Design a protein around this ligand. Structure first.
Ligand SMILES: *C(=O)N1C[C@H](NOS(=O)(=O)O)CC[C@H]1C(N)=O
Length: 262
């Protein structure tokens, strides 16, 4: 173990839960892993992959992101801050992608999932961009049950970091779609208490948070530190009891520990 890993272990031990971290430094492609090959429930962080999959579809349909998608009252689930304003109306796939990523709208996420033919279509996109680990099995809201030992709707920190890098910094998407994904992630509204809180204020972050049962507290981020090449950082966290409170400070602490290395 490295010093960063021993610090992450100490944070995890005092946290009362299970922490997973994966950093990729694209300055030199090095990786820091803590429980990097253990599965964690993704919860809302799976939305990135659904949005990227729709962006990928849009590479061969110029007008796909402008296509209207009907929002019915029955479509509303547990957290719909944008979709509820369009009930009995429509949202475009661009609007749904932005709502899913920036406001973590679960109705928008379900519309993205349906646009891909269900959770298996998101998993298939993951496979098509080289992610052998990601699996999406359910829609919102049950994909957030986050039951320990349940492999459904999970990934590992390493695989998620690798995928987020390919999507945001690599060529898993076309150039325009990559820029759109990064623009969406950087305009996230929900991230300031998570990885963002553990990094120097001068660094630009685009991220996607998630949370679920068992106190599951997740964040996945692409980071532009001042004067250095970007990083990819994945912090997953989950706890032993179903009603545990969210612990975004633990993600911030892990990010702060990561930041002290590179
Ligand atoms: C995603 O994990 N979810 C949607 C909603 N927003 O996520 S955030 O809090 O990480 O921004 C929170 C609840 C969760 C869900 N159970 O749908």
């Amino acid at each position: 173990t490295s010093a960063v890993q021993q610090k992450l272990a100490a944070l995890e031990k005092s946290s009362g839960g299970r922490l997973g971290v994966a950093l990729i430094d694209t300055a030199d492609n090095t990786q820091v892993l803590y429980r990097g090959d253990e599965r964690f429930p993704m919860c809302s962080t799976s939305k990135v992959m659904a949005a990227a999959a729709v962006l990928k579809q849009s590479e061969t349909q110029k007008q796909l992101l402008n296509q209207p998608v009907e929002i019915k009252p029955a479509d509303l689930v547990n957290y719909n801050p944008i979709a509820e304003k369009h009930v009995n109306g429509t949202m475009t796939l661009a609007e749904l992608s932005a709502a899913a990523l920036q406001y973590s709208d679960n109705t928008a996420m379900n519309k993205l999932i349906a646009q891909l033919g269900g959770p298996g279509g998101v998993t298939a996109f993951a496979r098509a961009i080289g992610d052998e680990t990601f699996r999406l099995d359910r829609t919102e809201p049950t994909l957030n049950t986050a039951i320990p030992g349940d492999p459904r709707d999970t990934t590992t920190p390493r695989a998620m970091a690798q995928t987020l890098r390919q999507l945001t910094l690599g060529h898993a998407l076309g150039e325009t779609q990559r820029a759109q994904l990064v623009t969406w992630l950087k305009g996230n509204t929900t991230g300031a208490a998570s990885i963002r809180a553990g990094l120097p204020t001068s660094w630009t972050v685009g991220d996607k948070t998630g949370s679920g049962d068992y106190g599951t507290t997740n964040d996945i981020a692409v980071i532009w530190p001042q004067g250095r090449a970007p990083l990819v950082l994945v912090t997953y966290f989950t706890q032993p009891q179903q009603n545990a409170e969210s612990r975004r400070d633990v993600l911030a602490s892990a990010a702060r520990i990561i930041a002290e290395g590179l």
